[PDB]
Amino acid sequence: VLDSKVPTGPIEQRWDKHRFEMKLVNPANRRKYTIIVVGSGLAGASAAATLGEAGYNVLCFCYQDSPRRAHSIAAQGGINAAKNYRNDGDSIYRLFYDTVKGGDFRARESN
Amino acid sequence: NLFDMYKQITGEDPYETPMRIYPAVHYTMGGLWVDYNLQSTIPGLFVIGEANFSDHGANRLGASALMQGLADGYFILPYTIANFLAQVKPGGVSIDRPEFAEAEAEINQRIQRLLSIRGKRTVDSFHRELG
Amino acid sequence: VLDSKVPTGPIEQRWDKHRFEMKLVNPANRRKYTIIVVGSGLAGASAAATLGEAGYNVLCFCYQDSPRRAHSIAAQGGINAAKNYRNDGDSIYRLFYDTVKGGDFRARESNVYRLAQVSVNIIDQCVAQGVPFAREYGGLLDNRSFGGAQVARTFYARGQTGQQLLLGAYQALSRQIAAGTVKMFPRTEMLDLVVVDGRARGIITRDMVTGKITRYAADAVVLATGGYGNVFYLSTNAKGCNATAIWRAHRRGAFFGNPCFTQIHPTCIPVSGEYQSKLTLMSESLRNDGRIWVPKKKGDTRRPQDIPESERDYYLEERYPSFGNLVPRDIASRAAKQVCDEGRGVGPGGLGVYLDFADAIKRLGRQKIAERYGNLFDMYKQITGEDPYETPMRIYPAVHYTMGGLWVDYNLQSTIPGLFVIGEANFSDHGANRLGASALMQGLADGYFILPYTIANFLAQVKPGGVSIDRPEFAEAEAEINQRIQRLLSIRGKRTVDSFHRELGKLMWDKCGMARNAAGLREALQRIPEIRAEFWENVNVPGEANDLNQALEKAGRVADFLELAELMCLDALHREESCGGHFREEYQTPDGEALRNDEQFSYVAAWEFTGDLAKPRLHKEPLVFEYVKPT
Amino acid sequence: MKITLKIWRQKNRNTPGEFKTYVMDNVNPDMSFLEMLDVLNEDLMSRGEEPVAFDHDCREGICGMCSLMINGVAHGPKNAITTCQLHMRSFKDGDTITVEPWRASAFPILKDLVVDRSAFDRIIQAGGYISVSTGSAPDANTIPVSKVAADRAMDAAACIGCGACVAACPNGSAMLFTAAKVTHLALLPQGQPERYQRVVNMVAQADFEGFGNCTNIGECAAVCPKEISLETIAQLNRDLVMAALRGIEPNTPIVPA
Amino acid sequence: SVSTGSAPDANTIPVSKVAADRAMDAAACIGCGACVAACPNGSAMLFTAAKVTHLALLPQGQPERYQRVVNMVAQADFEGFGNCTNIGECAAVCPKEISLETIAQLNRDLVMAALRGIEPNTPIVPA
Ligand SMILES: Cc1cc2nc3c(=O)[nH]c(=O)nc-3n(C[C@H](O)[C@H](O)[C@H](O)COP(=O)(O)OP(=O)(O)OC[C@H]3O[C@@H](n4cnc5c(N)ncnc54)[C@H](O)[C@@H]3O)c2cc1C
Ligand SMILES: Cc1cc2nc3c(=O)[nH]c(=O)nc-3n(C[C@H](O)[C@H](O)[C@H](O)COP(=O)(O)OP(=O)(O)OC[C@H]3O[C@@H](n4cnc5c(N)ncnc54)[C@H](O)[C@@H]3O)c2cc1C
Ligand code: SF4
Ligand code: SF4
Ligand code: F3S
Ligand code: F3S
Ligand code: FES
CA dihedral sign, ordered C298, C301, C304, C305: negative
For chain A, say whether B31 makes contact (Cβ under 8 Å): no
User: Do C502 and C274 contact (CB within 8 A), yes or no?
Assistant: yes
**CA–CA gap between residue E116 and residue C246 (Å, rounded):** 56
**CA–CA gap between residue B127 and residue B123 (Å, rounded):** 6
Classify residue C300 by burial, with Cβ atoms within 10 Å: 0-12, 13-18, 19+: middle
**CA–CA gap between residue C335 and residue C328 (Å, rounded):** 11
| C89·B79 Cβ contact <8 A | yes
Among C401, C430, C78, smallest CA distance to C264 is for: C401
> How many CB atoms are located within 10 Å of the residue C490 CB?
8
What are the two backbone dihedrals, phi and then psi, of residue C233, each rounded to the nearest 5 degrees?
A: -65, -40
Contacts of D238 (CB under 8 A, 6+ apart): none
**CA–CA gap between residue C363 and residue C357 (Å, rounded):** 10
Side by side, which strands form the sheet with C617-622?
A: C405-406, C256-257, C603-608, C617-622
**CA–CA gap between residue C503 and residue C510 (Å, rounded):** 11
* A62 Cβ closer than 6 Å to some ligand 1 atom: yes
Classify residue C362 by burial, with Cβ atoms within 10 Å: 0-12, 13-18, 19+: exposed
**CA–CA gap between residue E78 and residue A104 (Å, rounded):** 56
| E60·C141 Cβ contact <8 A | no
Say if strands C220-223 and C419-421 run parallel, antiparallel, or are unpaired: parallel
**CA–CA gap between residue D185 and residue D198 (Å, rounded):** 9
**CA–CA gap between residue A83 and residue A69 (Å, rounded):** 30
**CA–CA gap between residue C475 and residue C468 (Å, rounded):** 11
**CA–CA gap between residue C554 and residue C561 (Å, rounded):** 10
**CA–CA gap between residue D176 and residue D178 (Å, rounded):** 6
Among C560, C564, C573, C566, smallest CA distance to C605 is for: C573
Q: Which of A29, A30, A99 to mutate to test the interface with B (most CBs of B within 10 A)?
A: A99
Residues in chain B: 131
Q: Which residues does a gap of C–N over 2.5 Å follow in chain D? A: none
**SS3 sequence, chain D?**
CCEEEEEEECCCCCCCCEEEEEEECCCCCCCEHHHHHHHHHHHHHHHCCCCCCCCCCCCCCCCCCCCCEECCEECCCCCCCCCCCCEHHHCCCCCEEEEECCCECCECECCCCCECCHHHHHHHHCCCCCCCCCCCCCCCCCCCCCHHHHHHHHHHHCCCCCCHHHHHCCCCCCHHHHHHHHHHHHCCHHHHHHHHHHHHHHHHHHHHHCCCCCCCCCHHHHHCCCCCCCHHHHHHHHHHHHHHHCCCCCCCCCCCC
Q: What is the DSSP letter of E61?
A: G
Using a CB-CB cut-off of 8 Å, the residues of chain C touching B82 are 88-89
d(CA C415, ligand 2 centre) in Å: 23
**Of all protein residues, whose CA lies closest to atom 38 belonging to ligand 1?**
A39
DSSP track, C70-120:
SSSSS--S-EE----TT-SS--HHHHHHHHHHHTTS-S-HHHHHHHHHHHH
Cα of A29 vs its chain's centroid, Å: 24
Among C77, C66, C104, C48, smallest CA distance to C577 is for: C104
CA dihedral sign, ordered B49, B52, B56, B62: positive
Contacts of C317 (CB under 8 A, 6+ apart): C291, C293, C325
Cα of C427 vs its chain's centroid, Å: 10
What does the angle CA E85 – CA E89 – CA E91 come to, to the nearest 5 degrees? 105
**CA–CA gap between residue C515 and residue E29 (Å, rounded):** 69
Resolution in A: 2.9
Classify residue C241 by burial, with Cβ atoms within 10 Å: 0-12, 13-18, 19+: buried
**CA–CA gap between residue C516 and residue C507 (Å, rounded):** 12
| E10·A68 Cβ contact <8 A | no
| C91·A20 Cβ contact <8 A | yes
Contacts of B95 (CB under 8 A, 6+ apart): none
For chain A, say whether C94 makes contact (Cβ under 8 Å): yes
Among C263, C233, C210, smallest CA distance to C509 is for: C233
List D20's β-bridge partners, or say none.
Answer: D7
User: Do C259 and C74 contact (CB within 8 A), yes or no?
Assistant: no
What are the two backbone dihedrals, phi and then psi, of residue E6, each rounded to the nearest 5 degrees?
A: -95, 5
Which ligand sits nearest to residue B77's alpha carbon?
A: 1
**CA–CA gap between residue D15 and residue D119 (Å, rounded):** 22
Closest chain C residue to D55 measured between Cα atoms? C65
DSSP three-state, residue C432: coil
Contacts of D15 (CB under 8 A, 6+ apart): none
For chain A, say whether C12 makes contact (Cβ under 8 Å): no
Among C557, C531, B14, smallest CA distance to B6 is for: B14
Among C566, C616, C626, C625, smallest CA distance to C598 is for: C625
> How many CB atoms are located within 10 Å of the residue D139 CB?
15
What does the angle CA D73 – CA D79 – CA D83 come to, to the nearest 5 degrees? 65
User: Do C387 and C378 contact (CB within 8 A), yes or no?
Assistant: no
For chain B, say whether C324 makes contact (Cβ under 8 Å): no
**CA–CA gap between residue C37 and residue C223 (Å, rounded):** 6
DSSP three-state, residue E30: coil
> How many CB atoms are located within 10 Å of the residue C427 CB?
29
Using a CB-CB cut-off of 8 Å, the residues of chain A touching E4 are 49-50, 53
> What are the angstrom distances between the C-alpha of C463 and each of A42, C181, C420, C449?
65, 20, 18, 24
List C141's β-bridge partners, or say none.
Answer: C135
Using a CB-CB cut-off of 8 Å, the residues of chain C touching E63 are 137-139
What does the angle CA C300 – CA C274 – CA D49 come to, to the nearest 5 degrees? 145
Q: What is the DSSP letter of C539?
A: B
What does the angle CA A76 – CA A79 – CA A85 come to, to the nearest 5 degrees? 130
Q: Alpha helices of chain A — where are they, by DSSP H?
A: 14-21, 42-54, 92-102
Using a CB-CB cut-off of 8 Å, the residues of chain B touching C89 are 79, 82
DSSP three-state, residue C16: helix
Among C219, D206, A98, smallest CA distance to B55 is for: A98
Q: Which of C83, C84, C87 to mutate to test the interface with E (most CBs of E within 10 A)?
A: C87
Q: How far is C492 from chain D (nearest CA, A)?
A: 11
Which ligand sits nearest to residue D169's alpha carbon?
A: 5
DSSP three-state, residue C236: coil
DSSP three-state, residue C293: strand
> What are the angstrom distances between the C-alpha of B15 and each of B4, B5, B18, B20, E64?
10, 13, 8, 13, 48
User: Do C236 and C281 contact (CB within 8 A), yes or no?
Assistant: yes
DSSP three-state, residue C286: coil
User: Do C153 and A35 contact (CB within 8 A), yes or no?
Assistant: no
Contacts of C625 (CB under 8 A, 6+ apart): C100, C105, C109
Q: Which of C91, C120, C137, C144 to mutate to test the interface with E (most CBs of E within 10 A)?
A: C137
User: Do C189 and C553 contact (CB within 8 A), yes or no?
Assistant: yes
User: Do C336 and C353 contact (CB within 8 A), yes or no?
Assistant: yes
DSSP track, C183-214:
EEETTEEEEEEEEETTEEEEEEEEETTT--EE
Angle between helices B77-85 and A42-54 (to 10 degrees): 50
Residue E100 zone, left/alpha/beta (φ > 0; ψ -120 to 50; rest): alpha
**CA–CA gap between residue C361 and residue C356 (Å, rounded):** 9
**CA–CA gap between residue C388 and residue C392 (Å, rounded):** 6
**CA–CA gap between residue A70 and residue A79 (Å, rounded):** 17
Side by side, which strands form the sheet with D69-70?
A: D18-24, D3-9, D96-100, D69-70, D73-74
Among C458, C465, C463, C455, smallest CA distance to C54 is for: C455
Contacts of C306 (CB under 8 A, 6+ apart): none
Neighbouring subunits of D (3+ Cβ pairs under 8 A): C, E
Q: Given the residues C68, C201, C206, C329, select the one marked as catalytic.
A: C329
Cα of B8 vs its chain's centroid, Å: 30
- The amino acid sitting at D105 is S
Query: What distance separates the 2 farthest-apart alpha carbons in chain A?
Result: 49
Among C415, C419, C424, smallest CA distance to C607 is for: C415
DSSP track, chain B:
-HHHHHHHHH-S-TTTS--------------B---TTSB-SSTT-B--TTSB-TT-TTSPPTT-HHHHHHHIIIIIHHHHHHHHHTTS-S----TTSHHHHHHHHHHHHHHHHHHHH--SS-HHHHHHHH-
User: Do A42 and B69 contact (CB within 8 A), yes or no?
Assistant: yes
User: Do D113 and D33 contact (CB within 8 A), yes or no?
Assistant: no
> What are the angstrom distances between the C-alpha of C346 and each of C32, C294, C391?
62, 7, 13
Solving technique for this entry? cryo-EM
Q: How far is E23 from chain C (nearest CA, A)?
A: 18
DSSP three-state, residue A35: strand
DSSP track, C458-513:
HHTTS-S----TTSHHHHHHHHHHHHHHHHHHHH--SB-HHHHHHHHHHHHHHHSS
**CA–CA gap between residue E120 and residue E105 (Å, rounded):** 19
Say if strands C188-196 and C182-185 run parallel, antiparallel, or are unpaired: unpaired
User: Do C614 and C567 contact (CB within 8 A), yes or no?
Assistant: no
Residue D162 zone, left/alpha/beta (φ > 0; ψ -120 to 50; rest): alpha
**CA–CA gap between residue E16 and residue E3 (Å, rounded):** 25
Closest chain A residue to B65 measured between Cα atoms? A79
Contacts of C29 (CB under 8 A, 6+ apart): C464
User: Do C494 and C318 contact (CB within 8 A), yes or no?
Assistant: no
| B82·A106 Cβ contact <8 A | no
Among C510, C289, C525, smallest CA distance to C399 is for: C510
Strands (E), A29-95: 34-38, 57-61
**CA–CA gap between residue C259 and residue C425 (Å, rounded):** 11
Say if strands C353-356 and C312-313 run parallel, antiparallel, or are unpaired: unpaired
DSSP H or E stretch at residue C224? none
Classify residue D253 by burial, with Cβ atoms within 10 Å: 0-12, 13-18, 19+: middle
How many Cβ pairs closer than 8 A exist between chain B and E? 5
Say if strands C312-313 and C291-295 run parallel, antiparallel, or are unpaired: antiparallel
For chain C, say whether E12 makes contact (Cβ under 8 Å): no
**Of all protein residues, whose CA lies closest to atom 4 belonging to ligand 2?**
C75
User: Do A19 and C89 contact (CB within 8 A), yes or no?
Assistant: yes
Query: What distance separates the 2 farthest-apart alpha carbons in chain E?
Result: 46
DSSP H or E stretch at residue C38? strand C34-38
C329 catalytic per annotation: yes
Contacts of A47 (CB under 8 A, 6+ apart): A37, B48, B72, B73, B74, B77, B78
Say if strands C419-421 and C603-608 run parallel, antiparallel, or are unpaired: unpaired
